[PDB]
Write an enzyme that holds these catalytic residues in place. Sequence first.
Site, PDB file in Angstrom:
ATOM      1  N   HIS A 158      34.658  47.306  11.948  1.00 35.89           N
ATOM      2  CA  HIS A 158      35.441  46.091  11.787  1.00 35.89           C
ATOM      3  C   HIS A 158      36.414  45.864  12.952  1.00 35.89           C
ATOM      4  O   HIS A 158      36.502  44.753  13.473  1.00 35.89           O
ATOM      5  CB  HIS A 158      36.189  46.082  10.457  1.00 35.89           C
ATOM      6  CG  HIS A 158      37.190  44.978  10.336  1.00 35.89           C
ATOM      7  ND1 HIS A 158      36.832  43.644  10.307  1.00 35.89           N
ATOM      8  CD2 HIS A 158      38.542  45.008  10.234  1.00 35.89           C
ATOM      9  CE1 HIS A 158      37.922  42.903  10.195  1.00 35.89           C
ATOM     10  NE2 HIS A 158      38.971  43.707  10.136  1.00 35.89           N
ATOM     11  N   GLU A 175      41.317  36.735  10.341  1.00 30.21           N
ATOM     12  CA  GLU A 175      40.436  37.562   9.533  1.00 30.21           C
ATOM     13  C   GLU A 175      39.153  36.850   9.085  1.00 30.21           C
ATOM     14  O   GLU A 175      38.058  37.398   9.246  1.00 30.21           O
ATOM     15  CB  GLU A 175      41.185  38.129   8.323  1.00 30.21           C
ATOM     16  CG  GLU A 175      40.720  39.504   7.914  1.00 30.21           C
ATOM     17  CD  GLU A 175      41.195  40.571   8.869  1.00 30.21           C
ATOM     18  OE1 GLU A 175      42.412  40.625   9.155  1.00 30.21           O
ATOM     19  OE2 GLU A 175      40.353  41.353   9.339  1.00 30.21           O
ATOM     20  N   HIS A 182      37.478  42.419  15.779  1.00 30.79           N
ATOM     21  CA  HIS A 182      38.781  42.072  16.381  1.00 30.79           C
ATOM     22  C   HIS A 182      38.838  42.114  17.905  1.00 30.79           C
ATOM     23  O   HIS A 182      39.339  41.178  18.552  1.00 30.79           O
ATOM     24  CB  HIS A 182      39.912  42.953  15.814  1.00 30.79           C
ATOM     25  CG  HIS A 182      40.324  42.586  14.417  1.00 30.79           C
ATOM     26  ND1 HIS A 182      41.095  41.480  14.137  1.00 30.79           N
ATOM     27  CD2 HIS A 182      40.059  43.171  13.224  1.00 30.79           C
ATOM     28  CE1 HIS A 182      41.289  41.397  12.831  1.00 30.79           C
ATOM     29  NE2 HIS A 182      40.662  42.408  12.255  1.00 30.79           N
ATOM     30  N   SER A 201      32.218  41.367  11.487  1.00 32.51           N
ATOM     31  CA  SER A 201      31.820  42.755  11.275  1.00 32.51           C
ATOM     32  C   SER A 201      30.918  42.967  10.045  1.00 32.51           C
ATOM     33  O   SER A 201      30.357  44.047   9.881  1.00 32.51           O
ATOM     34  CB  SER A 201      33.056  43.643  11.171  1.00 32.51           C
ATOM     35  OG  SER A 201      33.875  43.245  10.085  1.00 32.51           O
TER      36      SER A 201
HETATM   37  C1  LIG Z   1      47.106  41.677  -0.995  1.00 31.76           C
HETATM   38  C2  LIG Z   1      47.440  42.770  -0.001  1.00 31.76           C
HETATM   39  C3  LIG Z   1      47.531  44.094  -0.427  1.00 31.76           C
HETATM   40  C4  LIG Z   1      47.839  45.107   0.484  1.00 31.76           C
HETATM   41  C5  LIG Z   1      48.060  44.825   1.832  1.00 31.76           C
HETATM   42  C6  LIG Z   1      47.981  43.517   2.311  1.00 31.76           C
HETATM   43  C7  LIG Z   1      47.678  42.472   1.442  1.00 31.76           C
HETATM   44  C8  LIG Z   1      47.594  41.079   1.963  1.00 31.76           C
HETATM   45  C9  LIG Z   1      48.710  40.244   1.889  1.00 31.76           C
HETATM   46  C10 LIG Z   1      48.632  38.938   2.370  1.00 31.76           C
HETATM   47  C11 LIG Z   1      47.454  38.445   2.935  1.00 31.76           C
HETATM   48  C12 LIG Z   1      46.311  39.238   3.029  1.00 31.76           C
HETATM   49  C13 LIG Z   1      46.329  40.553   2.563  1.00 31.76           C
HETATM   50  C14 LIG Z   1      45.087  41.418   2.662  1.00 31.76           C
HETATM   51  N1  LIG Z   1      44.734  41.677   4.054  1.00 31.76           N
HETATM   52  C15 LIG Z   1      43.488  42.104   4.369  1.00 31.76           C
HETATM   53  C16 LIG Z   1      42.940  41.831   5.615  1.00 31.76           C
HETATM   54  N2  LIG Z   1      41.703  42.258   5.897  1.00 31.76           N
HETATM   55  C17 LIG Z   1      40.972  42.958   4.993  1.00 31.76           C
HETATM   56  C18 LIG Z   1      39.596  43.425   5.317  1.00 31.76           C
HETATM   57  C19 LIG Z   1      39.018  43.111   6.552  1.00 31.76           C
HETATM   58  C20 LIG Z   1      37.725  43.542   6.855  1.00 31.76           C
HETATM   59  C21 LIG Z   1      37.003  44.281   5.922  1.00 31.76           C
HETATM   60  C22 LIG Z   1      35.603  44.759   6.237  1.00 31.76           C
HETATM   61  C23 LIG Z   1      34.573  43.637   6.168  1.00 31.76           C
HETATM   62  N3  LIG Z   1      34.429  43.150   4.803  1.00 31.76           N
HETATM   63  C24 LIG Z   1      33.255  44.156   6.670  1.00 31.76           C
HETATM   64  O1  LIG Z   1      32.339  44.378   5.848  1.00 31.76           O
HETATM   65  O2  LIG Z   1      33.112  44.351   7.892  1.00 31.76           O
HETATM   66  C25 LIG Z   1      37.574  44.583   4.683  1.00 31.76           C
HETATM   67  C26 LIG Z   1      38.865  44.156   4.381  1.00 31.76           C
HETATM   68  C27 LIG Z   1      41.523  43.228   3.747  1.00 31.76           C
HETATM   69  N4  LIG Z   1      42.760  42.798   3.465  1.00 31.76           N
HETATM   70 FE   LIG Z   2      40.923  43.222  10.321  1.00 31.30          FE
END
Ligand SMILES: Cc1ccccc1-c1ccccc1CNc1cnc(-c2ccc(C[C@H](N)C(=O)O)cc2)cn1
Ligand SMILES: [Fe+3]
Length: 274
Positions: free
Chosen positions: A153, A198, A158, A217
């Site tokens: 990823h 993202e 990125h 990714s």
């Molecule tokens: C809700 C939350 C909990 C804990 C930490 C941060 C957050 C939060 C708060 C506000 C906005 C977005 C978020 C979550 N942020 C994110 C950002 N990116 C990911 C994420 C990015 C890539 C991937 C892998 C992808 N699916 C792949 O298969 O390549 C898997 C997860 C997952 N979470």
């Molecule tokens: Fe990311």
Amino acid sequence: SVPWFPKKISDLDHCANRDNVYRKRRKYFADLAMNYKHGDPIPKVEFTEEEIKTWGTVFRELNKLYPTHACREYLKNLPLLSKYCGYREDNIPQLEDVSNFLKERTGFSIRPVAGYLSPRDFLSGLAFRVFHCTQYVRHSSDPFYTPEPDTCHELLGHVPLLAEPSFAQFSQEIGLASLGASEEAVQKLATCYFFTVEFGLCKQDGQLRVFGAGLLSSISELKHALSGHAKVKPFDPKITCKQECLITTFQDVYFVSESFEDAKEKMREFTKTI
Ligand SMILES: Cc1ccccc1-c1ccccc1CNc1cnc(-c2ccc(C[C@H](N)C(=O)O)cc2)cn1
Ligand SMILES: [Fe+3]
């Protein structure tokens, strides 16, 4: 009063740390991340056969889709990464190599991270053009999608865009806006980040392209995003920031920006209001 926030790049030292074979291997990468301090070169890792095979599959299949799915900026930088950082089916690029490449191009660098940082801590890194990256590879049982970020990823999603000046500026400005911001403001900035950096889509020469790293990714979500059985809305921070970010599944909605330049201006008008 104002919460603690990093004032210089090395202050990131103070927040970045906040089957049995797979488990032991993960602990190895977690320990490398925990012992890293700013100024260290990022530990180089001899990846296992299985790790390279999983990378190979991911890399091979995503490169079939990029030419028709990825935005032009992503495609422009991808070949430089092959040439200089060892992006190949049979070789996982090293974070230290990619870090050094980025430093020269946009001033971006990498710091290894063991687990999930809070959005505040993550965004604060971007203020200093530091991207916190995982170093391990996704479990071999799902190359096409994983609910947790892995090194594929970071490397495939990125890095190619962090090498682009307009995009690195956009990213850093989200970071800068978050520094010492309220909890409400951090959540909005992180949601806006989620639906651009993202999972963002863009319009280029009239066509939909993807620039979102979580899309670039994942073999299955990349195809899905442009299928198009996906619901798509225009990027607009005051509305986008309320949208729920889904983990564990595909998104229910993707947002379209007109350009990196435009999304940056929209974010500028928006941060004034929070
Ligand atoms: C809700 C939350 C909990 C804990 C930490 C941060 C957050 C939060 C708060 C506000 C906005 C977005 C978020 C979550 N942020 C994110 C950002 N990116 C990911 C994420 C990015 C890539 C991937 C892998 C992808 N699916 C792949 O298969 O390549 C898997 C997860 C997952 N979470
Ligand atoms: Fe990311």
